[PDB]
Design an enzyme around this catalytic site. Structure first.
Site, short mmCIF file in Angstrom:
data_model
loop_
_atom_site.label_atom_id
_atom_site.label_comp_id
_atom_site.label_asym_id
_atom_site.label_seq_id
_atom_site.Cartn_x
_atom_site.Cartn_y
_atom_site.Cartn_z
N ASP A 1 0.22 0.69 -6.36
CA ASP A 1 0.70 0.06 -5.14
C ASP A 1 -0.19 0.61 -4.00
O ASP A 1 -0.82 1.65 -4.17
CB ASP A 1 2.17 0.46 -4.94
CG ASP A 1 2.78 -0.16 -3.73
OD1 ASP A 1 2.66 -1.38 -3.60
OD2 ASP A 1 3.38 0.58 -2.92
N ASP B 1 6.26 2.96 -4.99
CA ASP B 1 7.31 3.59 -4.21
C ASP B 1 8.31 2.57 -3.69
O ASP B 1 9.32 2.95 -3.10
CB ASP B 1 6.73 4.31 -3.02
CG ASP B 1 6.07 3.36 -2.04
OD1 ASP B 1 5.95 3.68 -0.84
OD2 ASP B 1 5.67 2.27 -2.50
N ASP C 1 0.56 -6.53 0.72
CA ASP C 1 -0.13 -6.64 1.99
C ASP C 1 -1.33 -7.61 1.86
O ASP C 1 -1.65 -8.09 0.76
CB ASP C 1 -0.57 -5.25 2.45
CG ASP C 1 -1.04 -5.25 3.88
OD1 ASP C 1 -1.39 -4.16 4.40
OD2 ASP C 1 -1.07 -6.34 4.50
N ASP D 1 8.09 -2.85 -6.43
CA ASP D 1 7.27 -2.23 -7.49
C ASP D 1 8.09 -2.02 -8.75
O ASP D 1 7.56 -1.63 -9.79
CB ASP D 1 6.76 -0.84 -7.09
CG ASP D 1 5.69 -0.88 -6.03
OD1 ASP D 1 4.74 -1.68 -6.17
OD2 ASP D 1 5.82 -0.09 -5.07
#
Ligand SMILES: C/C=C(/C)C(=O)O[C@H]1C(C)=C2[C@H]([C@@H]1OC(=O)CCCCCCC)[C@@](C)(OC(C)=O)C[C@H](OC(=O)CCC)[C@@]1(O)[C@H]2OC(=O)[C@@]1(C)O
Ligand code: ALF
Ligand SMILES: [K+]
Ligand SMILES: [Mg+2]
Length: 994
Positions: A351, A703, A627, A707
């Site tokens: 991630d 985190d 993102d 995920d």
């Protein structure tokens, strides 16, 4: 039910046949609640107490040992005399161990917890709906809402179901959907249709997702879907399904446990062919009840000789030690099995935000106007250090610090950032670190000032707590904020009207401070600030500014930029409509451009060298983020996943793009792409599965709850220590220190363990090849049994146990992090090692039975029945072939067996020192190189002389031997094994390599 965010608000209402103003009717709620059910995620129900006990019992390794222990009863009853009440220890001990394996194994199933439950923590208890039977809004149970009814949300609320926004009351709606993108940045919704059918969540700017919360504003919408049919409901469905597979090692043990079954089942049918001495040789004579136990008594003995039941005990203790070991290196493992799989890792999926990055927006660059003459415009670029919200950094021009106050423009730059900002910094006393209060994109400016320290106010002595808002506090003093024109989508900017301090009656002195998207704010500037003076905005000065903005927001330094302006002569305070945002643009006109700030959620300090360490260990690191691609690629270029100039146009996709590739192209993109951006929770999972379709061991590092699906999907889920509970709950391993570097350390440790493990597994099983050859011989000939299962259990559980487990501490090879990942296909024993043990197997398979014909044939201090036809007659059911007959039960003496058993026990102490390596003679492999191996062997031969002398013990195991020479006999039957092995190696160490 409706799955369109691509339809008009009018069409969505039409869909469910509900009025925007009234809401669903009771009858409609009766039917919808009917057709769609309640709005709540189903809970997976945990451990099935009858199916965690059953898993330990269903594996031929215990099935065979069961029937055997069970057959140890059929043959336990048949014993004349009082020696039947003192002959059930064998069937006892046997089962008793299968119980220990059950107990011991089970206790470590440490998924103690529910990730599904953790997820449900995101579904609120109450929801607010408008329905026909009332004008006032109603607060109902969230599970009672259905697709179709009007819902209302506002500041603080947690979206109760997937909703299509119909109307925004606030001038803007600010939502926080990190729960589905891993990003806390507040996203600004609207209510227009989003045309794209295949749109991703990050695209549905006109939808509200169940589980996210409203950062700001108030809105009205229509419920599109509920329960399981929602984005978070999908995460839930993907978690539920996925189950962890058996370890590469566990696997080996499986195929093995199958063959080992096929073998014996044939060895028996093989003795029924040789020993046709009860089917076509003798007479009437009873052997259909006595000599019939020669096809069962060896059945439950052949089993305990093939099944090294004790191996589990070793691995378990080994792994558990690794656990605490790694736990010192800051990696908390919650499941031993992943400890071994962690060694053979070829792909680490990761991630970005909050994992590879700190997830704390930072102003790292900023510039102001320097000099103007017609057609020539020079700026004053600057860089800021610091990667956290902590005021821990200094500004610097040309990589050398420069007190910001000595620059006029930077005094104004800093003033706007502190004033036109609705957020703040804050030192969390408990955790020990500063944290943001409000929009992270704004707190970035708050921290920027504390660093800039434009007025030089002394802050070195301040408390860690109060220095949080020192320099900003000052600025608040210098100016009083009157009111602030909000942010509006039609102008992509906001402002704050302010008045000069200590000036009560006058008109002059007031000004607004603007900030927002460069393009827009710039265009509304007729003047540019030059230090303190002010000059008009010409084309040359315009493009100059833009140029740097264009470069700053796209290069290898993709940065979110903000234009910062001021209106020196703001309109009359009593000439503005502060209730109509549509008027803010004109009040934000005739502006004076001041400067530009570049933000970024920077990489953690140690990631770059960690990525390198993986490269060296030949492990691939792929980034998968929610993102934006622009930003992901810029992070990969800093983290080292991509070179700074490396052409990436074909090895970095967005989820959308990736959905558009053909299945084949996708599976393939997974092997070359190293950066997937703007993905949904399923994309992460999908990529992992593809990566796994190459028999590759993949790790997932995250985190967020977005995920979760991939964490549960990888062979190894690694959550951050600071991550979300659900991410943690779904992982097999946690990073107590958030340092991506400890993953590297963990892989190392896991590699080392896997080796040593591999050793005691080829050592503890090789013996079984000898124990089986031994039995097969002592039955293919007819000779008296030299070894009975009872003994064959001590030898495998302790006698071998202690040594085998000492090997687990084999000194880790040096330069073990510069070798590629072990291939899963690679069997523990194949090739020349299959023969070396195939050899060491026959030797012991013989040297044990032969030790028996030493107490009978070559017998000196024993029945010297030299070639008394052990093969022919052991029977003695008429003493005729022997004249002076009055004793034939010597073939049952405890001495002919105390031989094979003593040889065996002594041969294993050797192979143990032989298996301290694979291709290294004990001369290059000193036995003292493994302290715990020496002590173990001592501890081993010292347990032999225990179950050989402690009166009760030998009663059950059979009687003694005097070191007379008989022991010395046992030696020249074992020790040479060392020589044999030491040779077999040279045969490879040179003939095969070197
Ligand atoms: C435990 C005892 C025995 C005798 C056994 O049946 O093991 C075979 C076997 C099934 C394998 C072999 C054994 O091969 C033999 O010894 C052949 C039979 C000879 C006995 C008859 C008397 C002459 C293993 C034990 O041993 C040696 C010494 O060659 C190593 C390895 O095992 C592992 O990797 C398991 C580790 C958990 C496996 O080749 C395995 O086959 C596979 O698929 C593997 C990859 O599993
Ligand atoms: F923080 Al992410 F994808 F959820 F990088
Ligand atoms: K997993
Ligand atoms: Mg994250």
């Amino acid at each position: 039910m409706e799955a369109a965010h691509s339809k008009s608000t009018e069409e969505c209402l039409a869909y469910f046949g509900v009025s925007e103003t009234t809401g669903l009717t009771p009858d409609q709620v009766k039917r919808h609640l009917e057709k769609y059910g309640h709005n709540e995620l189903p809970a997976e129900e945990g451990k099935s107490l009858w199916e965690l006990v059953i898993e330990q019992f269903e594996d031929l390794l215990v099935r065979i040992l069961l029937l055997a222990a069970c057959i140890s009863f059929v043959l336990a009853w048949f014993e004349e005399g009082e020696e039947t009440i003192t002959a059930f220890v064998e069937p006892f001990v046997i089962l008793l161990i299968l119980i220990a394996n059950a107990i011991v194994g089970v206790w470590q199933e440490r998924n103690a917890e529910n990730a599904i439950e953790a997820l449900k923590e995101y579904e609120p208890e109450m929801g607010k709906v408008y329905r026909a039977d009332r004008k006032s809004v109603q607060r109902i149970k969230a599970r009672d809402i259905v697709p179709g009814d009007i819902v209302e949300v506002a500041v603080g609320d947690k979206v109760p179901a997937d909703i299509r926004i119909l109307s925004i009351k606030s001038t803007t709606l600010r939502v926080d959907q990190s729960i589905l993108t891993g990003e806390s940045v507040s996203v600004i919704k609207h209510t227009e249709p989003v045309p794209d059918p295949r749109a991703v969540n990050q695209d549905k700017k006109n939808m509200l997702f169940s589980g996210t919360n409203i950062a700001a504003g108030k809105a009205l919408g229509i419920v599109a879907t509920t329960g399981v049919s929602t984005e978070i409901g999908k995460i839930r469905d993907q978690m539920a399904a996925t189950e962890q597979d058996k370890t590469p090692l566990q696997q080996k043990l499986d195929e093995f446990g199958e063959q080992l079954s096929k073998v014996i089942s044939l060895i028996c049918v093989a003795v029924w062919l040789i020993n046709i001495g009860h089917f076509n040789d003798p007479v009437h004579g009873g052997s259909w009840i006595r000599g019939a136990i020669y096809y069962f008594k060896i059945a439950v003995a052949l089993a305990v000789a093939a099944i090294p039941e004790g191996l589990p005990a070793v691995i378990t203790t080994c792994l558990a030690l690794g656990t605490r070991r790694m736990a010192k290196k800051n990696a908390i493992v919650r499941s031993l099995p992943s400890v071994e799989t962690l060694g053979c890792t070829s792909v680490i999926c990761s991630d970005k935000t909050g994992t590879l990055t700190t997830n704390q927006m930072s102003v790292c660059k900023m510039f102001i106007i320097d000099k103007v003459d017609g057609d020539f415009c020079s700026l004053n670029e600057f860089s800021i250090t610091g990667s956290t919200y902590a005021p821990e950094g200094e500004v610097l021009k040309n990589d050398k610090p420069i007190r910001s106050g000595q620059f006029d423009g930077l005094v104004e730059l800093a003033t706007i950032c502190a004033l036109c900002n609705d957020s703040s910094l804050d030192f969390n006393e408990t955790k020990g670190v500063y944290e943001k209060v409000g929009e992270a994109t704004e707190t970035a400016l708050t921290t920027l000032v504390e660093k800039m320290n434009v007025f030089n106010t002394e802050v070195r002595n301040l408390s860690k707590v109060e220095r949080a808002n020192a320099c900003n506090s000052v600025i608040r003093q210098l100016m009083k904020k009157e009111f602030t024109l909000e942010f509006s989508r039609d102008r992509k900017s906001m402002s704050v009207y302010c008045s000069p301090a200590k000036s009560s009656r006058a008109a002059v002195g007031n000004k607004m401070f603007v900030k927002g998207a460069p393009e827009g704010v710039i265009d509304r500037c007729n003047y540019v600030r030059v230090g303190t003076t002010r000059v008009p905005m010409t084309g040359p000065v315009k493009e100059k500014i833009l140029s740097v903005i264009k470069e700053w927001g796209t290069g290898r330094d993709t940065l979110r930029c903000l234009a910062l302006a001021t209106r020196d002569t703001p309109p009359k305070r009593e000439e503005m409509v502060l209730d109509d945002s549509s008027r803010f643009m004109e009040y934000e006109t005739d502006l004076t451009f001041v400067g530009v700030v570049g933000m970024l959620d920077p990489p953690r300090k140690e990631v770059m060298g960690s990525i390198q360490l993986c490269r060296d260990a030949g492990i691939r690191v792929i980034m998968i983020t929610g993102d934006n691609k622009g930003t992901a690629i810029a992070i990969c270029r800093r983290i080292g996943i991509f070179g700074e100039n490396e052409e990436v146009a074909d090895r970095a996709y967005t989820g959308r793009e990736f959905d558009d590739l053909p299945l084949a192209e996708q599976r393939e993109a997974c092997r070359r792409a190293c950066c997937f951006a703007r993905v949904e929770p399923s994309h992460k999972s999908k990529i992992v599965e593809y990566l796994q379709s190459y028999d590759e061991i993949t790790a997932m590092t995250g985190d967020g709850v977005n995920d979760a699906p991939a964490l549960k999907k990888a062979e190894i889920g690694i959550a951050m220590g600071s991550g979300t509970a659900v991410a943690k709950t779904a992982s097999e391993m946690v990073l107590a220190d958030d340092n991506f570097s400890t993953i590297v350390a963990a892989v190392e440790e896991g590699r080392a363990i896997y080796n040593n493990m591999k050793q005691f597994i080829r050592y503890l099983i090789s013996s079984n090849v000898g124990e089986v050859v031994c039995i097969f011989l002592t039955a293919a000939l007819g000779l008296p049994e030299a070894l009975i299962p009872v003994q064959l259990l001590w030898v495998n559980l302790v006698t071998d146990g202690l040594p085998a487990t000492a090997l687990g501490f084999n000194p880790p090879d040096l330069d073990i992090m510069d070798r590629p990942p072990r291939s899963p296909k690679e069997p523990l024993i194949s090739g020349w090692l299959f023969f070396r043990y195939m050899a060491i197997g026959g030797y012991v398979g013989a040297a044990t039975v032969g030790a028996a014909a030493w107490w009978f044939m070559y017998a000196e201090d024993g029945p010297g029945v030299t070639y008394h036809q052990l093969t022919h007659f052991m029977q003695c059911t008429e003493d005729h072939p022997h004249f002076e007959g009055l004793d034939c039960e010597i073939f049952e003496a405890p001495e002919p067996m105390t031989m094979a058993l003593s040889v065996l026990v002594t041969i294993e102490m050797c192979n143990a020192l032989n298996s301290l390596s694979e291709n290294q003679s004990l001369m290059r492999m000193p036995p003292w190189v493994n302290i715990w191996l020496l002590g173990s062997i001592c501890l081993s031969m010292s347990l032999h002389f225990l179950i050989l002398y402690v009166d009760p013990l030998p009663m059950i195991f059979k009687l003694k031997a005097l070191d007379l020479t008989q022991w010395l006999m046992v030696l020249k039957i074992s020790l040479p094994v060392i020589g044999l092995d030491e040779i077999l190696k040279f045969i490879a160490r040179n003939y095969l390599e070197g």
